């Protein structure tokens, strides 16, 4: 039928001026272009077919050829930036935007998908899709009282494409585009389909991956409670973007971080900081590090939620990149914490795993640990208890490691190490 045509035959059919011959040739192109094993994208491009496909998107009396070319162009646009650029170069962006209004749901959906691929290429094509006015028709497809009346795959496609309009930096998406999209995004973030939740949550993570003003737009929409709820989900595909979004938000101001805490996020961290997925633990610990960089009352809520033992645990045993985030969380904690909070940290057992990580070859983690120890000694000074900490560090082999760090190549490490020797082990 239309199975395994040559590109040359596809060209012959598409260059006939017979719409039905063109349809069958376009379907044959679609079938080539949708095979998983090496779809001949560049051959189709090189045969000059993209402009014909784009012209077929406008064949209103001819919805099957609209669909077939939309699918063909979608998969071409799914490839490299050069392959996506060829689709854009053929005029596909306004054609696909016009196709969003198709009364045929499967065609509308295919145009949604193709625009998602185009926008997914990068900020430039994302902004170009926005400039051609994709957002209004995309959002109009979701302007129903209850998202649950929409077809499942259709809604997931719309969510995914919207998330690509929220994606990428240098530049971030246009502020008015974000403002226009956000209420619908918030709708999707409360939907019951796990894939819609995951992609909405990714979209929110992109929007919060930026300056405090970007974070504020999201936080002001009141999504933090829902993010915290998703943070506790059982599905890893939902926890991951929820944790990234929460982690992004706490890189913001202390007040933005406070929303995260007020929404109850800290109660999820016993599980997050022991999560068997390495990247969850790492990003939970990174998130903790930006919370312990907060105000003393925020450190206190970390304490109250029982999270210092969990930091001790991650410091004691975790993927090394997670232990690095934990070292940072401790240094931030000891930099901003009260004497009592820092004392509490020692009582939880921080010293020995902190010492054990001074054997790491990573130069940066050593400075982080040395600085935390400095901060802990300064707290010990204020209680006249310096020497007890010196014994503690002595008894677990920490002083041996600090001594040996005088012999470290890095200047700031050898310095900070020799200082620690000069003030507390003399």
């Amino acid at each position: 039928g239309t199975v395994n045509w040559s590109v040359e035959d596809i060209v012959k059919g598409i260059n006939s001026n017979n719409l039905e011959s063109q349809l069958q040739a376009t379907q044959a192109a679609r079938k080539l272009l949708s095979r998983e094993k090496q779809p001949p994208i560049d051959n189709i491009i090189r045969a000059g077919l993209i402009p014909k496909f784009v012209s077929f998107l406008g064949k209103t009396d001819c919805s099957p050829i609209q669909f077939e070319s939309a699918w063909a162009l979608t998969n071409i646009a799914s490839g490299t930036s050069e392959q996506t650029k060829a689709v854009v170069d053929g005029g596909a962006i306004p054609a696909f935007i016009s196709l969003l209004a198709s009364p045929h749901a499967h065609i509308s959906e295919q145009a949604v998908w193709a625009l998602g691929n185009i926008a997914g290429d990068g900020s430039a094509f994302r902004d170009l899709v926005i400039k051609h006015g994709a957002i209004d028709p995309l959002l109009a497809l979701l302007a129903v009282p209850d998202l649950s009346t929409l077809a499942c795959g259709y809604l997931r496609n719309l969510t995914w494409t919207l998330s690509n309009l929220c994606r990428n930096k240098n530049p971030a998406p246009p502020l008015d585009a974000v403002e226009q999209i956000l209420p619908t995004l918030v709708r999707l973030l409360h939907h019951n389909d796990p894939e819609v939740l995951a992609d909405s949550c990714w979209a929110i993570s992109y929007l919060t991956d930026g300056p405090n003003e970007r974070i504020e737009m999201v936080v002001k929409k009141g999504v933090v409670p829902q993010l915290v709820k998703l943070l506790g989900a059982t599905e890893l595909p939902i926890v991951t973007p929820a944790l990234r979004a929460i982690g992004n938000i706490v890189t913001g101001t202390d007040e933005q971080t406070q929303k995260v805490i007020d929404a109850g996020a800290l109660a999820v961290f016993p599980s997050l900081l022991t999560n068997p997925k390495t990247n969850i633990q790492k990003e939970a610990t990174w998130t903790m590090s930006n919370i312990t960089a907060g105000r003393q009352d925020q450190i206190q809520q970390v304490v109250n939620h029982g999270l210092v033992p969990f930091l001790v645990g991650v410091l004691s045993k975790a993927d090394f990149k997670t232990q690095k985030e934990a070292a940072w969380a401790i240094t931030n904690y000891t930099s901003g914490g009260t004497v009592e909070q820092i004392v509490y940290l020692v009582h939880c057992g921080i010293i020995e795993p902190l010492m054990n990580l001074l054997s790491a070859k990573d130069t940066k983690i050593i400075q982080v640990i040395l600085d935390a120890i400095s901060n802990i000694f300064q707290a010990a000074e204020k209680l006249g208890e310096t020497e007890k900490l010196s014994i503690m560090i002595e008894e677990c082999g920490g002083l041996d490691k600090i001594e040996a760090l005088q012999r470290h190549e890095n200047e700031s490490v050898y310095k900070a190490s020799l200082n620690l020797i000069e003030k507390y082990f003399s």
């Binding site: 949708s34 979608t74 998969n75 490839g79 691929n117 290429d121 995914w160 998330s163």
Partner: peptide, 11 residues
């Protein structure tokens, strides 16, 4: 994570 671009295999 997730996919910047999606290839349509079927349906």
């Amino acid at each position: 994570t997730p996919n910047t671009k999606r290839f349509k295999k079927e349906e």
